[PDB]
Amino acid sequence: FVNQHLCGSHLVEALYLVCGERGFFYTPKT
Amino acid sequence: FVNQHLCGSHLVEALYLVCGERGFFYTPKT
Amino acid sequence: FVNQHLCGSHLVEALYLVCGERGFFYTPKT
Amino acid sequence: FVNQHLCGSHLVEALYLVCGERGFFYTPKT
Amino acid sequence: FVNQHLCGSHLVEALYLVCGERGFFYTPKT
Amino acid sequence: FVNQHLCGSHLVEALYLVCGERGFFYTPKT
Amino acid sequence: GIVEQCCTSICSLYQLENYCN
Amino acid sequence: GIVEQCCTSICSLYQLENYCN
Amino acid sequence: GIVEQCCTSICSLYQLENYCN
Amino acid sequence: GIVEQCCTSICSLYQLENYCN
Amino acid sequence: GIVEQCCTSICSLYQLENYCN
Amino acid sequence: GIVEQCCTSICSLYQLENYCN
Ligand SMILES: [Zn+2]
Ligand SMILES: [Zn+2]
Numbered sequence: 001f002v003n004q005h006l007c008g009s010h011l012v013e014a015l016y017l018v019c020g021e022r023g024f025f026y027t028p029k030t
Numbered sequence: 031f032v033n034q035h036l037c038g039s040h041l042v043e044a045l046y047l048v049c050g051e052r053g054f055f056y057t058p059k060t
Numbered sequence: 061f062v063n064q065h066l067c068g069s070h071l072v073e074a075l076y077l078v079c080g081e082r083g084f085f086y087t088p089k090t
Numbered sequence: 091f092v093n094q095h096l097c098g099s100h101l102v103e104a105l106y107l108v109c110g111e112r113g114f115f116y117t118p119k120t
Numbered sequence: 121f122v123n124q125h126l127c128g129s130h131l132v133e134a135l136y137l138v139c140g141e142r143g144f145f146y147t148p149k150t
Numbered sequence: 151f152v153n154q155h156l157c158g159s160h161l162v163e164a165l166y167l168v169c170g171e172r173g174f175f176y177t178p179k180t
Numbered sequence: 181g182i183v184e185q186c187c188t189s190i191c192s193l194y195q196l197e198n199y200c201n
Numbered sequence: 202g203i204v205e206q207c208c209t210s211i212c213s214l215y216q217l218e219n220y221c222n
Numbered sequence: 223g224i225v226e227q228c229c230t231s232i233c234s235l236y237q238l239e240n241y242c243n
Numbered sequence: 244g245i246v247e248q249c250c251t252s253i254c255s256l257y258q259l260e261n262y263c264n
Numbered sequence: 265g266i267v268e269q270c271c272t273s274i275c276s277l278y279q280l281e282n283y284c285n
Numbered sequence: 286g287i288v289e290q291c292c293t294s295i296c297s298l299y300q301l302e303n304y305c306n
Contacts, residue, residue: 005190006070007250010126011259012042014167015245016056018256019263020298023057026046027222028246035295036160037208040096041217045203047074048214049221050193057264058204065274066130067187071196072102075182076116078193079200080214086106087113087243088183095211097229100156101238105224107134108235109242110277117201118225121252127271131280132162135266136176138277139284140235143177146166147306148267155232157292165287168298169305170256177285178288235277 004028034058064088094118124148154178 008028015024038058045054068088075084098118105114128148135144158178165174182199185191203220206212224241227233245262248254266283269275287304290296 001189002067002187004246004250007122008246009043009046009070011245011249012046013039013163014259015262016039016042017164017167018259021058022264023055023059024262024264025053025055026245027053028051029053031294032157032292034204034208037092038204039160040099041203041207043073044077044217045220047077048193048217052222054220054222056203061273062127062271064183064187068183069103069106069130071182071186072106073099074196075199076099076102078196078214081118082201083115083117083119084199084201085113085115085117086182087115088111089113091210092208094225094229097152098225100159101224101228103133104137104238105241107137108238112243114241114243116224122250124267124271125253128267129163129166131266131270132166133159134280135283136158136162138235138280141178142285143175143179144283144285145173145175145177146266147173147175148171149173151231152229154288154292158288161287161291164301165304168301172306174304174306176287 008026012026015026038056042056045056068086072086075086098116102116105116128146132146135146158176162176165176182196186196203217207217224238228238245259249259266280270280287301291301
């Protein structure tokens, strides 16, 4: 059941940290 | 000294959680 | 096996953030 | 300025983890 | 599929907190 | 007052994530 | 309550607001 | 915007909702 | 209580255990 | 994109850097 | 050790204290 | 080392990679 709400929260921390001083966008949709 | 790298990480957790199933963008720049 | 100890920790972050300046209680029991 | 909203979020993680299977209550007020 | 990268990150938080002022080591290997 | 207990917790998340499949050690002492 | 109605399925911010003090 | 208006002072859920997509 | 006695200074696991249910 | 290519399998820092602004 | 004995089943604070320095 | 050189000032991924095993 649950897994997408927690899976999309573990990539945000490893997302802005990768770019560094830059930012990024996050939009889950097809 | 440090404070912006930790201040921008405390709002990300309270950013995607606010929208909910929707996403959002984050770009620190003027 | 593990899943309740981690499932109850992902809701705490999205719990106090929802109320805002207010607080809340958490007691896992029937 | 900011500090109480982040200081009360660092104790929640170290609060339910201390109790363990038990729960606790959080209400910031005098 | 994913689960070890997230399982080893939930114990790090409950690792340094247990020791307290002391530190510890983390090496996932046989 | 508080700042080292929270400053040493923000580097652990950005520590094991940098190594990747490898691990690391953490010991705050002179 | 929240250890099952939300632990077995994501909920909405409105439902989580009903648990506020 | 959020790296100053809320980074130098906590904000409300309503103001943070204005940054939603 | 915990929003000042521990928010202005780290505490010990023993003191945090007194706040357990 | 990231809600599937990396949500169903860990990825590398190089692939995650492609999503940078 | 901790990547299996506790990664496949929650443990207690006493067992986690044995991994302390 | 990391409890001061990076605890008093953000660092780069290259410097943090030097602390890898
Ligand atoms: Zn998780
Ligand atoms: Zn913090």
